Amino acid sequence: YRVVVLSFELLHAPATVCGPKKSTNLVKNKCVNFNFNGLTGTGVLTESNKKFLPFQQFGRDIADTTDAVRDPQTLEILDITPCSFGGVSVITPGTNTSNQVAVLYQDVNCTEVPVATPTWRVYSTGSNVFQTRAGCLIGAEHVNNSYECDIPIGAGICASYQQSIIAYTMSLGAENSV
Amino acid sequence: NCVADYSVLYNSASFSTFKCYGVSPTKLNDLCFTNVYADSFVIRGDEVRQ
Amino acid sequence: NQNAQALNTLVKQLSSNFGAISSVLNDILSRLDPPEAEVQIDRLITGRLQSLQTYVTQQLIRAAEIRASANLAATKMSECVLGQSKRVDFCGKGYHLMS
Amino acid sequence: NQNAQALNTLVKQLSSNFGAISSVLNDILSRLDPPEAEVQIDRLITGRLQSLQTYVTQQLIRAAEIRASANLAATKMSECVLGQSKRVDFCGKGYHLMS
Amino acid sequence: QYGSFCTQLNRALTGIAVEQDKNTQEVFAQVKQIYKTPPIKDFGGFNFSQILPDPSKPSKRSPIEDLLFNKVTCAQKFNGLTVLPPLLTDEMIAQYTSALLAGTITSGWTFGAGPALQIPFPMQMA
Ligand SMILES: *[C@@H]1O[C@H](CO)[C@@H](O)[C@H](O)[C@H]1NC(C)=O
Ligand SMILES: *[C@@H]1O[C@H](CO)[C@@H](O)[C@H](O)[C@H]1NC(C)=O
Ligand SMILES: *[C@@H]1O[C@H](CO)[C@@H](O)[C@H](O)[C@H]1NC(C)=O
């Protein structure tokens, strides 16, 4: 009988031995998955320079999350960065008082919120977006006047109910000089 | 430094159990592996349990 | 320091494979059959969840300790700053006057 | 509320199969032979044991916190009801008279 | 299929976080009103300008607090962990501390047991 065995020894994913017929152009900056030279992953792409050795191939980092991709055809270097993520909190008054609420996302920017049933589309784009260092809460009006701390939000912000939910900086009590 | 082209393996018939995948499940001809060493040899073929 | 070290320990547990073949989420899916790596996923998630439970328990212990320390801080602040205490070595060394 | 929630979570863990085929041991005995039911039951045992261990640890933490609260309550009783205390914010807002 | 361990872990961490928020609120928010030191600084010779906030620096802290904050002092973010901000920032905590300092300097000990009554600092020390 004729038998052939193969060594394999899978330790380095971006190598030179692969011939899939699929070909696609390179993406500069899009929050999309990548499959360059057999290496899979997700994140956003960003171009930068690094003193990489020529004979070497790629660079892996903590938790074996590679931060570099090289084009087999054209010689250039790009860096990767994982996508923005976080929880979403809901700021509500008493359920019997009213039904309207104001969500608060975690440490994310207001730009990518719309990207990430018909009533749910309203909160995506946002008509009263408030940007705060604790998070990007929407649906609550920002008032310059300050009040007592009713609902706890991070970094000295508090939301109350006056027929619309408002968000303000909490006051530390009435001032007085003896 | 070649194209591998493992799709030819599914052709013909007979062969034997692969009994060696040992990575993870999804698609066959995507990963680039590390090194493809072919060491074809001919035995009596009485038992391949070795 | 303890918080940062515990957090670093928690994230280093993703590198260990807990007896599986690989230890990364992308290497969870290459070419073989799901069950073959489903057990592998079972092995991975068991270890990761055990590490997470260990982290949560240690955090609970440390939170209880810090809550006790801060309750002491609150009562000390309220009894030494907001008044003069007759306790011997509760508001310093010697006869306490003000804080 | 915390005690009831922990108890409800502990009992609800029996529904989860922890990677077995069924959460009811009667069906495990009825379908699986004892040589294979031996290895199938192991998952149920380890999962329920893990749930019970987590519950016991959480209850220990809660009992320590409540013991701290009870010690504070006993101290306040002895120092405010059985006498008058000079500690400022230990007997309400203002100078203490009685409790 | 492994159960509901994740809900318990999330609940425990959330409980710890709210515990710390309420904890710092309990430690510092000991007064209902904000007191401020009078513009003229005379207390019989005691020099509190070293201990009170100074208007010159943009950060409303005291020179002891500046050393206390400077003396004591990254790709781990992107695997499923976040750090919530404290309920009240460092500026508000410093404002609470400044109010407490002004209260104990001017009123004495009575600002924590009712209305704050002024009294000269030499007499308070007496
Ligand atoms: C909310 O209002 C309803 C009135 O329909 C009342 O039955 C309920 O007790 C209220 N809940 C609270 C927490 O006040
Ligand atoms: C959010 O994105 C906008 C768009 O460029 C930018 O101006 C803003 O500074 C970003 N927010 C933060 C906190 O950097
Ligand atoms: C409130 O603050 C904003 C932001 O500084 C300012 O544009 C606005 O004029 C202020 N007053 C009112 C009434 O909105």
Short mmCIF file of all heavy atoms in Angstrom, two decimals, chain A residues 12-53:
data_model
loop_
_atom_site.label_atom_id
_atom_site.label_comp_id
_atom_site.label_asym_id
_atom_site.label_seq_id
_atom_site.Cartn_x
_atom_site.Cartn_y
_atom_site.Cartn_z
N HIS A 12 2.47 28.64 13.86
CA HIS A 12 2.63 29.96 13.27
C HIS A 12 1.61 30.09 12.15
O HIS A 12 1.78 29.49 11.08
CB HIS A 12 4.06 30.14 12.75
CG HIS A 12 4.32 31.46 12.09
ND1 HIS A 12 5.52 31.76 11.49
CD2 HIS A 12 3.54 32.55 11.93
CE1 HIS A 12 5.47 32.99 10.99
NE2 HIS A 12 4.28 33.49 11.25
N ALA A 13 0.55 30.86 12.39
CA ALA A 13 -0.55 30.94 11.43
C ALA A 13 -0.17 31.74 10.18
O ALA A 13 -0.40 31.25 9.06
CB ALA A 13 -1.80 31.53 12.09
N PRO A 14 0.41 32.96 10.29
CA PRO A 14 0.82 33.66 9.07
C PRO A 14 2.10 33.09 8.46
O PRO A 14 3.20 33.57 8.73
CB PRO A 14 1.02 35.11 9.54
CG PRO A 14 1.34 34.99 10.97
CD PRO A 14 0.54 33.83 11.47
N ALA A 15 1.95 32.05 7.64
CA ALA A 15 3.05 31.45 6.90
C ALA A 15 2.79 31.60 5.40
O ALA A 15 1.85 32.27 4.97
CB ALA A 15 3.24 29.99 7.30
N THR A 16 3.64 30.96 4.60
CA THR A 16 3.62 31.16 3.15
C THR A 16 2.89 30.07 2.38
O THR A 16 2.63 30.25 1.19
CB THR A 16 5.05 31.26 2.61
OG1 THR A 16 5.78 30.08 2.97
CG2 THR A 16 5.75 32.48 3.18
N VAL A 17 2.55 28.95 3.02
CA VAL A 17 1.97 27.80 2.31
C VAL A 17 0.45 27.87 2.47
O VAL A 17 -0.13 27.35 3.43
CB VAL A 17 2.57 26.47 2.78
CG1 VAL A 17 2.59 26.38 4.30
CG2 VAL A 17 1.83 25.29 2.16
N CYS A 18 -0.20 28.52 1.51
CA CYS A 18 -1.66 28.56 1.42
C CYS A 18 -2.09 29.11 0.07
O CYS A 18 -1.54 30.11 -0.40
CB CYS A 18 -2.25 29.42 2.54
SG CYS A 18 -1.25 30.85 3.00
N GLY A 19 -3.06 28.46 -0.57
CA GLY A 19 -3.48 28.86 -1.89
C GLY A 19 -4.97 29.00 -2.14
O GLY A 19 -5.46 28.57 -3.19
N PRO A 20 -5.73 29.59 -1.21
CA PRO A 20 -7.16 29.77 -1.48
C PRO A 20 -7.38 30.67 -2.68
O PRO A 20 -6.64 31.63 -2.91
CB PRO A 20 -7.68 30.41 -0.19
CG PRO A 20 -6.52 31.15 0.34
CD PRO A 20 -5.31 30.33 -0.01
N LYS A 21 -8.41 30.35 -3.47
CA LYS A 21 -8.67 31.11 -4.69
C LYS A 21 -9.33 32.45 -4.41
O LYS A 21 -9.43 33.28 -5.33
CB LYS A 21 -9.54 30.28 -5.64
CG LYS A 21 -10.81 29.74 -5.02
CD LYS A 21 -11.53 28.80 -5.98
CE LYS A 21 -10.64 27.64 -6.38
NZ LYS A 21 -10.19 26.86 -5.20
N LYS A 22 -9.78 32.69 -3.18
CA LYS A 22 -10.42 33.96 -2.86
C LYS A 22 -9.38 35.07 -2.72
O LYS A 22 -8.35 34.89 -2.05
CB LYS A 22 -11.24 33.83 -1.58
CG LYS A 22 -10.49 33.25 -0.39
CD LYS A 22 -11.38 33.16 0.83
CE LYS A 22 -10.63 32.62 2.04
NZ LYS A 22 -10.12 31.25 1.81
N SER A 23 -9.65 36.21 -3.34
CA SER A 23 -8.77 37.37 -3.26
C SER A 23 -9.61 38.62 -3.03
O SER A 23 -10.67 38.78 -3.65
CB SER A 23 -7.93 37.53 -4.53
OG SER A 23 -8.75 37.72 -5.67
N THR A 24 -9.15 39.48 -2.14
CA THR A 24 -9.86 40.71 -1.81
C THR A 24 -8.84 41.82 -1.58
O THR A 24 -7.71 41.57 -1.15
CB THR A 24 -10.74 40.54 -0.57
OG1 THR A 24 -11.43 39.28 -0.64
CG2 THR A 24 -11.77 41.66 -0.48
N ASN A 25 -9.25 43.06 -1.88
CA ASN A 25 -8.37 44.19 -1.66
C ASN A 25 -8.20 44.46 -0.17
O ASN A 25 -9.00 44.03 0.67
CB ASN A 25 -8.91 45.43 -2.37
CG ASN A 25 -10.21 45.93 -1.76
OD1 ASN A 25 -10.20 46.75 -0.85
ND2 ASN A 25 -11.33 45.44 -2.27
N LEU A 26 -7.14 45.18 0.17
CA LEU A 26 -6.78 45.47 1.55
C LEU A 26 -7.59 46.65 2.06
O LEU A 26 -7.84 47.62 1.33
CB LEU A 26 -5.29 45.75 1.68
CG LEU A 26 -4.68 45.71 3.09
CD1 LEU A 26 -3.31 45.07 3.05
CD2 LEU A 26 -4.61 47.10 3.69
N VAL A 27 -8.00 46.58 3.33
CA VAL A 27 -8.80 47.61 3.97
C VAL A 27 -7.90 48.45 4.86
O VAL A 27 -7.12 47.92 5.65
CB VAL A 27 -9.96 46.99 4.78
CG1 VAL A 27 -10.38 47.92 5.90
CG2 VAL A 27 -11.13 46.69 3.88
N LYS A 28 -8.01 49.78 4.72
CA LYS A 28 -7.18 50.69 5.50
C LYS A 28 -7.72 50.85 6.92
O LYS A 28 -7.02 50.59 7.90
CB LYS A 28 -7.08 52.04 4.80
CG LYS A 28 -6.01 52.11 3.71
CD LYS A 28 -6.47 51.44 2.43
CE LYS A 28 -7.74 52.07 1.88
NZ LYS A 28 -8.19 51.42 0.62
N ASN A 29 -8.98 51.29 7.05
CA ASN A 29 -9.56 51.53 8.37
C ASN A 29 -11.06 51.22 8.28
O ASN A 29 -11.85 52.10 7.93
CB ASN A 29 -9.31 52.96 8.82
CG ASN A 29 -9.70 53.19 10.27
OD1 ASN A 29 -10.54 52.49 10.83
ND2 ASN A 29 -9.09 54.20 10.89
N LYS A 30 -11.43 49.99 8.63
CA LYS A 30 -12.82 49.59 8.78
C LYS A 30 -12.91 48.57 9.90
O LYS A 30 -12.09 47.65 9.98
CB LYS A 30 -13.39 48.98 7.48
CG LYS A 30 -13.62 49.98 6.35
CD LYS A 30 -14.67 51.01 6.73
CE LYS A 30 -14.84 52.04 5.63
NZ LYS A 30 -13.57 52.76 5.33
N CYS A 31 -13.91 48.74 10.77
CA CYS A 31 -14.10 47.83 11.90
C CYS A 31 -14.69 46.51 11.39
O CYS A 31 -15.87 46.20 11.54
CB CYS A 31 -15.00 48.47 12.95
SG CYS A 31 -15.33 47.41 14.38
N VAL A 32 -13.82 45.72 10.75
CA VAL A 32 -14.21 44.46 10.14
C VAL A 32 -13.21 43.39 10.53
O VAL A 32 -12.09 43.67 10.97
CB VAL A 32 -14.30 44.57 8.60
CG1 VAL A 32 -15.43 45.50 8.19
CG2 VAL A 32 -12.97 45.05 8.02
N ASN A 33 -13.63 42.13 10.37
CA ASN A 33 -12.75 41.01 10.63
C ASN A 33 -11.69 40.89 9.54
O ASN A 33 -11.85 41.39 8.42
CB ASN A 33 -13.54 39.71 10.73
CG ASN A 33 -14.58 39.56 9.63
OD1 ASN A 33 -14.35 39.95 8.49
ND2 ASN A 33 -15.73 39.00 9.97
N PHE A 34 -10.59 40.23 9.88
CA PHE A 34 -9.47 40.05 8.97
C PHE A 34 -9.03 38.59 8.97
O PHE A 34 -9.06 37.92 10.00
CB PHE A 34 -8.29 40.96 9.35
CG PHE A 34 -7.89 40.86 10.79
CD1 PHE A 34 -6.90 39.97 11.18
CD2 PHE A 34 -8.49 41.65 11.75
CE1 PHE A 34 -6.53 39.87 12.51
CE2 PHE A 34 -8.12 41.57 13.07
CZ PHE A 34 -7.14 40.67 13.46
N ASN A 35 -8.62 38.12 7.80
CA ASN A 35 -8.16 36.75 7.60
C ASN A 35 -6.89 36.74 6.77
O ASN A 35 -6.74 35.96 5.82
CB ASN A 35 -9.25 35.90 6.95
CG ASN A 35 -9.08 34.42 7.24
OD1 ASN A 35 -7.97 33.95 7.52
ND2 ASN A 35 -10.17 33.67 7.17
N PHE A 36 -5.95 37.61 7.11
CA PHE A 36 -4.70 37.71 6.36
C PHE A 36 -3.76 36.57 6.74
O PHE A 36 -3.43 36.40 7.92
CB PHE A 36 -4.03 39.06 6.61
CG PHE A 36 -4.72 40.21 5.95
CD1 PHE A 36 -5.48 41.10 6.69
CD2 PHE A 36 -4.60 40.42 4.58
CE1 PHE A 36 -6.11 42.17 6.08
CE2 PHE A 36 -5.24 41.48 3.97
CZ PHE A 36 -5.99 42.36 4.72
N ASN A 37 -3.34 35.81 5.74
CA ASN A 37 -2.39 34.71 5.92
C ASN A 37 -2.88 33.72 6.98
O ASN A 37 -2.11 33.24 7.82
CB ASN A 37 -1.00 35.24 6.27
CG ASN A 37 -0.39 36.06 5.15
OD1 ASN A 37 -0.26 35.58 4.02
ND2 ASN A 37 -0.01 37.29 5.45
N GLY A 38 -4.17 33.41 6.93
CA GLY A 38 -4.75 32.41 7.80
C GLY A 38 -5.01 32.86 9.22
O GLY A 38 -5.58 32.09 10.01
N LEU A 39 -4.63 34.08 9.59
CA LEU A 39 -4.86 34.58 10.93
C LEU A 39 -6.21 35.29 10.99
O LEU A 39 -6.45 36.25 10.25
CB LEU A 39 -3.74 35.53 11.35
CG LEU A 39 -3.37 35.57 12.83
CD1 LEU A 39 -2.00 36.22 13.01
CD2 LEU A 39 -4.41 36.32 13.65
N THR A 40 -7.08 34.83 11.88
CA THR A 40 -8.41 35.38 12.03
C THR A 40 -8.49 36.26 13.28
O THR A 40 -7.74 36.06 14.24
CB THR A 40 -9.47 34.27 12.11
OG1 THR A 40 -9.14 33.37 13.18
CG2 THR A 40 -9.52 33.49 10.81
N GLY A 41 -9.39 37.23 13.24
CA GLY A 41 -9.56 38.14 14.35
C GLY A 41 -10.48 39.28 13.96
O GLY A 41 -10.84 39.45 12.80
N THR A 42 -10.85 40.07 14.97
CA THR A 42 -11.75 41.20 14.79
C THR A 42 -11.19 42.42 15.50
O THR A 42 -10.43 42.31 16.46
CB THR A 42 -13.16 40.90 15.31
OG1 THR A 42 -13.08 40.47 16.68
CG2 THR A 42 -13.82 39.81 14.48
N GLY A 43 -11.59 43.59 15.01
CA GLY A 43 -11.13 44.85 15.58
C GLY A 43 -11.18 45.94 14.53
O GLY A 43 -11.84 45.81 13.50
N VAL A 44 -10.47 47.03 14.82
CA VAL A 44 -10.34 48.14 13.89
C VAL A 44 -8.87 48.24 13.50
O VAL A 44 -7.98 47.82 14.24
CB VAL A 44 -10.85 49.47 14.49
CG1 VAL A 44 -9.89 50.01 15.54
CG2 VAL A 44 -11.10 50.51 13.40
N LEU A 45 -8.63 48.80 12.31
CA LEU A 45 -7.29 48.84 11.75
C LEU A 45 -6.74 50.27 11.79
O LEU A 45 -7.47 51.24 11.58
CB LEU A 45 -7.29 48.33 10.31
CG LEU A 45 -7.45 46.83 10.06
CD1 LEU A 45 -6.48 46.04 10.91
CD2 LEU A 45 -8.88 46.35 10.28
N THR A 46 -5.44 50.38 12.06
CA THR A 46 -4.79 51.68 12.16
C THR A 46 -3.36 51.54 11.66
O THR A 46 -2.67 50.58 12.01
CB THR A 46 -4.81 52.20 13.60
OG1 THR A 46 -6.16 52.37 14.03
CG2 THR A 46 -4.08 53.53 13.69
N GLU A 47 -2.91 52.49 10.85
CA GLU A 47 -1.59 52.42 10.25
C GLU A 47 -0.57 53.17 11.11
O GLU A 47 -0.82 54.29 11.55
CB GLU A 47 -1.60 53.00 8.83
CG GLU A 47 -2.53 52.26 7.88
CD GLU A 47 -2.43 52.76 6.45
OE1 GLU A 47 -1.59 53.65 6.19
OE2 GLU A 47 -3.19 52.27 5.59
N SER A 48 0.57 52.53 11.34
CA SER A 48 1.66 53.11 12.10
C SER A 48 2.96 52.43 11.70
O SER A 48 2.96 51.45 10.95
CB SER A 48 1.42 52.99 13.61
OG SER A 48 1.51 51.64 14.03
N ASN A 49 4.07 52.96 12.20
CA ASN A 49 5.39 52.46 11.88
C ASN A 49 6.01 51.74 13.08
O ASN A 49 5.72 52.06 14.24
CB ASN A 49 6.31 53.59 11.41
CG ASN A 49 6.19 54.84 12.27
OD1 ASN A 49 5.64 54.80 13.37
ND2 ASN A 49 6.71 55.95 11.78
N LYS A 50 6.86 50.77 12.78
CA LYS A 50 7.51 49.96 13.80
C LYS A 50 8.84 49.45 13.25
O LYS A 50 8.96 49.18 12.05
CB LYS A 50 6.62 48.79 14.23
CG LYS A 50 7.22 47.89 15.30
CD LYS A 50 6.32 46.69 15.57
CE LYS A 50 6.15 45.83 14.33
NZ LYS A 50 5.27 44.66 14.58
N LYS A 51 9.82 49.33 14.14
CA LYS A 51 11.16 48.86 13.75
C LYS A 51 11.20 47.33 13.70
O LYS A 51 11.96 46.67 14.40
CB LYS A 51 12.20 49.41 14.71
CG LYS A 51 12.29 50.93 14.73
CD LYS A 51 12.68 51.48 13.37
CE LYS A 51 12.73 53.00 13.38
NZ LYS A 51 11.41 53.59 13.72
N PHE A 52 10.35 46.78 12.84
CA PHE A 52 10.27 45.33 12.69
C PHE A 52 11.48 44.80 11.93
O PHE A 52 11.96 45.42 10.98
CB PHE A 52 8.98 44.94 11.95
CG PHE A 52 8.50 43.56 12.27
CD1 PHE A 52 9.14 42.78 13.22
CD2 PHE A 52 7.41 43.03 11.60
CE1 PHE A 52 8.69 41.50 13.50
CE2 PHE A 52 6.96 41.75 11.88
CZ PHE A 52 7.61 40.99 12.83
N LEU A 53 11.98 43.65 12.36
CA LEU A 53 13.05 42.98 11.64
C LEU A 53 12.55 42.52 10.28
O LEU A 53 11.40 42.10 10.14
CB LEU A 53 13.57 41.79 12.44
CG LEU A 53 13.74 41.95 13.96
CD1 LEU A 53 12.47 41.61 14.72
CD2 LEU A 53 14.90 41.10 14.46
#
